[PDB]
C-alpha cells in the first residue's frame, strides 16, 4: 500500500554510482582543478539558487503544516544546545570556543539538497508528493537560526586570538550575520518568498525554460563535485579524536532521528493515525540524512580544525547509506503481513548479496594478484572468501530459482547452505589457527587436512540433513526449507563453531579482529534459532532478530571488505 | 483662517537662539571637548533612536497619503540625478568620482529633525497635525535610496586612490551598502516597522515615559551640539571653492523646492484644490530646509573634500532662515484679504526691524570701541548706521503706537520719514564721498558742511511735506499717511540720490561694496513708487513690491552688519 520501499533501493544505486563515477575521475588524475572549479561555482552560484527559486516560486503556503517545522527546528535546537553545553563543559579552555563554534554545527546541518532529495523524490513521488516541498523549508531556516550562534564563537575565538580588547560584542555579532547572510542561500530564500509575493503564484515561462534546464542538472553536478571533494582528504588521526568522532557521528545519525520521532508524536494531536504514523517516517528518514560539505567550507574559511571536519564528512556520507537503508526497511516491517514480511527479506537479502558479491571478488582480485595467500594464514581466508562469495551467489540464484525449477531449487539449496555452512565452521577453523601460532609451535600445520576437512565436514551435514529431513517447498524462506531439523543442525554448528572460538580467544592482528567481529553475529544467528525453538509461538520482537541474522549471513562479506581491503 | 503663520517666527527664534547659546558658550573655552562628546553621542545613540521609536510604534499606515512620498522621493532623485552627471561632466577625472560622491548626497540630505520639526509642528501644530508625521517618512526612505548610490562612488574612488585591480564591483557593492546600513537611523526604522506589526499599534507603557524624556530633550541637544560643531571651520577657500558653493547652494534652496512645487501639482490630481495648496505650501517649506551634518560626518570619515562640505553646511544653517521666512509669508500673502496683508507687512516689518537693531546696536558698539571714526571716511558711516537704527526704532514705536495717541503718532512719523530718507541721501553722500577720494586732490573736505547737509535737508523735506501734505489716519500703512505727495517726494529723493550714486560710480574696498549694494534696493523703491503712480488700477504684482520694498527698507541694517561686522 502505502510507503513504497521498492524504489528506494534504485535511487541509492545512482545516488552513490555518481559519487563513485566522480571520485574514480578523481584519483585517476583525468580531470583538474580548473574544470572541478568550474563545476563547483556553477553548483554554488548557478544551479542550487535556480532549483531553489523555482521550487520555492510555486509553494502554496495556504495548505502548509508547520507542525513539521516547529518539530523539526525545536529537535535541531535542542540537539544543537545539548552539543554546545557539553563541548563548552569537556574541551580544554585553551581553544575551547572554536570547538564550540564548529562542532554542534556539524550537528544540524546536513546534505539535504543532493542527497536527501533524490530518496525523499523516490519513495514519496506517487504516494506523499507535498513532502518533497518540506525540504527546502528545513535547510534555510534552521540555517537562519542555528549556524549564525555559532558564527559568534568561531569570532570570539578569533578575537581572542588577537587579544585585541577594542573590539566590542556588537561588532561581533555584526560580522556573525555579515557571515551568515553572505551565504548565498538566505538572500535567494528572500527573494524567493520576495517574488512569490509579487507575482502571486505566477511563474513566467520566459525563464521557466531556463530555470528547469539550470535546477535539472544541479544534482548531479553537486554530487559529481561532491565525489571529486574527497580524493585525499582521509588522514589518521589520534585516539582522541578517533573518539570525539565517533561521538559526532553518533549524536548524528541515532540522536537527532529519535529525538524528531518522540517529539513529532508528542507535538502533533491529528487523526487518521496513519498520516501520524506517516509523518513520524518522514521525519525519522529526514533525521538520518548526512552531512553537507556546507561546514567542511566553514572550518576551511576559519581555517580551523578542517581536517577533522572533512573527515568526518566523508565518511558520514558513506556510513550513512547503510543506516537509512535498514531505517526505512525496519520502519516498514510491522505495517506488513508475514509473507510481505518475507518477500521483503528476499529483497533486502538480494540487495546486500549483490553489493557484497561487487565486494567479494573485488578483495578476492587485490588477493590474488597480490600472491600472498602462499604462506599461512592467507590461504584458509581466501577460501572462506571463496564460500562467502559462493553463498552470496547462491542467494542471487536462489531468488531467481525460487519457484521456477524443482530439481535446480534443490541443489542451490543443498549448495548454498554448504557454503553457508562453511563459512560458520571456517570462523572457528581460523580461531585454531590464530590459536595455534599464537603458541609458537615449531609444529607443522597440517593444511592438507585443515581445507579438506573445512569443506568436507559442512558438505557432509548438508548431505545427512537432505537424507534425514523431510522437503517442505511451501515455506519462501530458506530457513524452513525441511522443517525443525535444518535449523536445529544450524543450531548445533553454531554452538560448536562458537565453543570453538572461545576456546581459541604476518597481519595477526587483522585475522584477530576478523576472529572478533565475526563471532557477535555468530551470537545473533544462535539467538535467533535458540528462540524460535524454544518460543514455539510467535512473539512479537523475532522480526529484527531475522532480518539481522539474515544481514549478517547475506552481507557479513561487507567486514572482510573493510578489514581485509586494504 | 489656515496656516496660522503668527507662530513661525518665535520657533525660528528659539531653534536660532539655542544655536548661538551652543556657539557663545564654544568660543570662550568654556565647554570643552569631553561633555561636548558625550552630549553628541547621546544625540547620536539615545535620543534620537528613542523619539523615531516613539514616533513610528504609531503611525497609522492605513491612512496615510502616498503622493506625498512619491513626490518628493522622485524630486530628490532628479535632483541627485541632475547634480551627479553635472559633476561627472565638469570635474576633471583626477578626483572626479570623489565629487560625484559627495557633492550630489550634499543636495539630497537635509536636516529635518532637529531644525525642521520645530517650524513644521509651529507651522502645522493645530491646523494640520497629521503632516508632522510625513517628516520621519522622508529623511530615512530617501536615505535607503540615494545616499548609498553615492557611497559606491566614494568607495570607487578610494579602489581607484589604492590601484588594486582586484577589487570587484561585488566588493564595493557590499562595502557601500554595509556603510549605509551601519548607520543607526537605518536599523532603528526596520526595528520599529518591525515593533509596530508586531504590537499592533501598542506602545509599553513601562518604557513610555522613558521614550518621552529621551525623546523631548533630543532637540535642544541636537540643536546645542550642532552650535559646538562650528566654532572654527569657517576658512577662506579658493574662487572656484566659492563659485562651486554657490552653486550648490542654489541649488539646495531654489531648484529642490520649485521642483517639488511643480510635481506636487503635476501628480496629485484631489479634489478641494484648497487641500492641494496647502499640500503644495508643505511640500515647499520642506524642500528650504537646510543641510543636516551627516553629510559633513561621512566627508570625514571618507577624508575627502571635508572643509567645502563642513563650510557649505555651516552657511547653509544660516542662510536658511531668511529664505524660509520669506518664502512662508510670500505663499501666504495670495490667500488674504488686503487689510490682512497690511497687517501681515506691518509684522514682518517689526521682526526684521528687531532683529536688525540688534545688528546695528552691535555694529555700533564695536565701531565707537575701534576709535576708528576720528579719519575718513568713517564718521559718515557711523551717522548712517545711527540713521538706520534710529529708524528701526520709529518701526518699533510706530507699530507700537499705529492707534494709540494722535501727536505721539504725527512726531513718530515725522522723525522716521526724516531717518529713512537721511539713509537714502547717505547713500548719495557716501557715493560722493567715495567719488572725490578717488580723485586723489589733497582738497580739504568740509565735513562739517555734508554732514549738517545729511540731517538737514531731509529734515526740510519732512517739514515741507507735513506743512505742504494732508493728514490721512485711516491709512495703516505708513506710506499713504497723506497720500499723493508723499510718495512723490519719495521718488524725487530716490530719483535724486540714485543719479548722485550713477554720476559718483583705509578699507575703500567695503565702503565700495556697500556703495553698490545699496543702490539694488533703491531701484527697487523706484519701480514701486513709479508703479503706484503710473498704474492707478492695481495689479497682481504689486504685492511682492511692496513686501521687497518693506523688507529692503527695514532690514537694510543686516548688509551693513555683514560688510561693516567683521
Not at 549556524?147 to 556573525?176: H, M, R, Y
Not at 513520524?280 to 529526514?286: R, V
Not at 556520507?317 to 518475507?342: E, G, H, R
Not at 519457484?403 to 580461531?431: C, M, P, R
Request: proline share 4%; net charge positive; charged share 10%.
Amino acid at each position: 500500500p502505502s510507503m513504497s520501499i521498492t524504489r528506494l533501493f534504485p535511487a541509492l544505486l545512482e545516488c552513490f554510482g555518481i559519487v563513485l563515477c566522480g571520485y574514480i575521475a578523481g584519483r585517476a588524475n583525468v580531470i583538474t582543478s580548473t574544470q572541478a572549479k568550474g563545476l563547483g561555482n556553477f553548483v554554488s552560484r548557478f544551479a542550487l539558487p535556480a532549483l531553489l527559486f523555482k521550487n520555492m516560486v510555486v509553494l502554496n503556503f495556504s495548505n502548509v503544516d508547520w507542525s513539521f517545522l516547529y518539530s523539526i527546528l525545536i529537535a535541531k535546537a535542542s540537539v544543537f544546545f545539548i552539543v554546545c553545553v557539553l563541548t563548552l563543559l569537556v574541551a580544554s579552555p585553551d581553544s575551547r570556543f572554536s570547538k564550540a563554534g564548529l562542532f554542534p554545527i556539524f550537528a544540524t546541518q546536513s546534505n539535504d539538497f543532493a542527497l536527501g532529495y533524490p530518496i525523499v523524490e523516490a519513495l514519496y513521488q506517487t504516494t506523499y508528493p507535498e513532502y518533497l516541498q518540506y525540504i527546502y523549508l528545513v535547510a534555510p531556516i534552521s540555517l537562519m537560526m542555528l549556524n549564525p550562534i555559532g558564527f559568534i564563537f568561531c569570532e570570539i575565538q578569533k578575537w581572542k586570538d588577537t587579544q585585541n580588547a577594542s573590539q566590542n560584542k556588537i561588532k561581533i555579532v555584526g560580522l556573525g550575520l555579515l557571515r551568515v547572510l553572505q551565504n548565498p542561500i538566505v538572500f535567494m530564500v528572500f527573494i524567493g518568498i520576495a517574488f512569490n509575493f509579487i507575482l502571486d503564484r505566477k511563474v513566467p515561462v520566459y525563464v521557466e525554460n531556463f530555470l528547469d534546464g539550470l535546477g535539472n542538472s544541479f544534482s548531479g553536478s553537486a554530487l559529481f563535485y561532491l565525489g571529486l571533494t574527497m580524493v585525499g582528504k582521509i588522514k589518521r588521526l589520534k585516539k582522541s579524536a578517533f573518539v570525539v568522532l565517533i561521538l559526532l557521528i553518533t549524536a548524528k545519525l541515532l540522536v537527532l532521528p529519535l529525538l524528531c520521532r518522540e517529539m513529532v508524536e508528542l507535538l502533533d494531536k491529528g487523526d487518521s493515525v496513519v498520516n501520524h504514523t506517516s509523518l513520524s517516517n518522514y521525519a525519522f528518514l529526514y533525521g538520518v540524512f548526512p552531512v553537507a560539505p556546507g561546514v567542511a567550507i566553514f572550518a576551511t574559511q576559519f581555517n580551523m580544525e578542517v581536517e577533522i571536519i572533512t573527515s568526518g564528512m566523508v565518511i558520514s556520507t558513506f556510513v550513512s547509506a547503510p543506516i537509512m537503508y535498514v531505517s526505512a526497511w525496519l520502519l516498514t516491517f510491522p505495517t506488513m503481513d508475514p509473507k510481505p514480511l518475507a518477500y521483503a527479506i528476499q529483497n533486502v537479502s538480494f540487495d546486500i548479496s549483490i553489493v557484497s558479491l561487487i565486494s567479494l571478488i573485488w578483495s578476492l582480485a587485490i588477493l590474488l594478484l597480490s600472491k600472498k595467500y602462499k604462506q599461512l594464514p592467507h590461504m584458509l581466508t581466501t577460501n572462506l572468501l571463496i564460500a562467502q562469495s559462493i553463498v552470496c551467489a547462491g542467494m542471487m540464484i536462489w531468488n531467481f530459482v525460487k519457484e521456477k525449477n524443482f530439481v535446480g531449487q534443490i541443489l542451490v539449496f543443498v549448495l548454498l547452505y554448504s557454503s553457508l555452512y562453511s563459512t560458520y565452521l571456517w570462523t572457528g577453523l581460523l580461531a585454531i589457527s590464530l590459536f595455534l601460532l599464537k603458541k609458537r609451535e615449531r609444529v607443522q600445520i597440517p593444511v592438507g587436512i585443515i581445507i579438506i576437512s573445512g569443506w568436507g565436514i559442512p558438505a557432509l551435514l548438508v548431505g545427512v540433513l537432505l537424507i534425514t529431513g523431510k522437503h517442505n517447498g511451501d515455506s519462501i524462506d530458506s530457513a524452513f526449507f525441511y522443517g525443525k531439523e535444518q535449523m536445529i543442525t544450524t543450531a548445533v554448528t553454531l554452538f560448536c563453531s562458537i565453543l570453538i572460538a572461545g576456546i581459541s580467544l604476518q597481519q595477526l592482528t587483522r585475522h584477530v579482529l576478523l576472529c572478533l567481529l565475526l563471532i557477535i553475529g555468530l551470537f545473533a544467528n544462535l539467538s535467533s534459532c535458540l528462540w524460535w525453538l524454544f518460543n514455539q509461538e510467535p512473539g512479537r520482537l523475532y522480526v529484527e532478530l531475522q532480518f539481522f541474522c539474515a544481514v549478517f549471513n547475506f552481507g557479513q562479506g561487507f567486514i572482510s571488505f573493510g578489514i581485509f581491503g586494504l
